[PDB]
């Protein structure tokens, strides 16, 4: 009982009632979001996508958090050429919990 859907350019396989982290979305932390772009739905019986994105499959998900990822330190260094550079990055992420998976 799991489904495959495309959210932020990268596909996720999520089972019922589990939390999945995906790219930042323009949704407030206390609102449900829709994912009608369901790549595949799996159950005891198997249903595939003759046309991409099934026919009526949707996924109900609730936003939980809108935090930032772990800091990543970017170092660029040229050997013997008197060039050093430092940078930091924290990627924005959105935690969402899957509430319901349709057929």
């Amino acid at each position: 009982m799991y489904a495959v859907f495309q959210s932020g350019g990268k596909q996720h396989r999520v089972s019922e009632g589990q939390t999945v982290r995906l790219e930042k979305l323009d949704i407030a932390t206390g609102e449900t979001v829709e994912f009608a772009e369901v790549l595949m739905i799996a159950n005891g019986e198997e249903v595939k996508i003759g046309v991409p994105f099934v026919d009526g499959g949707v996924i109900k998900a609730e936003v939980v958090a809108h935090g930032r990822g772990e800091k990543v330190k970017i170092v660029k260094f040229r050997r013997r050429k008197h060039y050093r550079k430092q940078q930091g990055h924290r990627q924005w992420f959105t935690d969402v919990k899957i509430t319901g998976i349709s057929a």
């Binding site: 008197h82 060039y83 050093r84």
Partner: protein
């Protein structure tokens, strides 16, 4: 209010400091390049030097004279 006065924008530049790190830009000789006479401490050529060629103020002939009546 003595701790609220500020100068006009662009009045100060903070100057250039040489040889203080890589990220500061002009470090490691502070913008005077690699070896050479100009890179040395106190190096350089005097005014009018052309590297040995006859200077312009020597190739040309002196002309005229100064009139004392012009100053009065």
């Amino acid at each position: 209010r003595l701790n609220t006065l500020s100068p006009a924008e662009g009045s100060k530049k903070a100057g250039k400091r040489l040889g203080r790190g890589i990220g500061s830009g002009l470090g490691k000789t502070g913008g005077r390049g690699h070896k050479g006479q100009k890179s040395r401490s106190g190096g350089g050529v005097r005014r009018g030097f052309e590297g040995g060629q006859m200077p312009l103020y020597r190739r040309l002939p002196k002309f005229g004279f100064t009139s004392r009546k012009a100053a009065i």
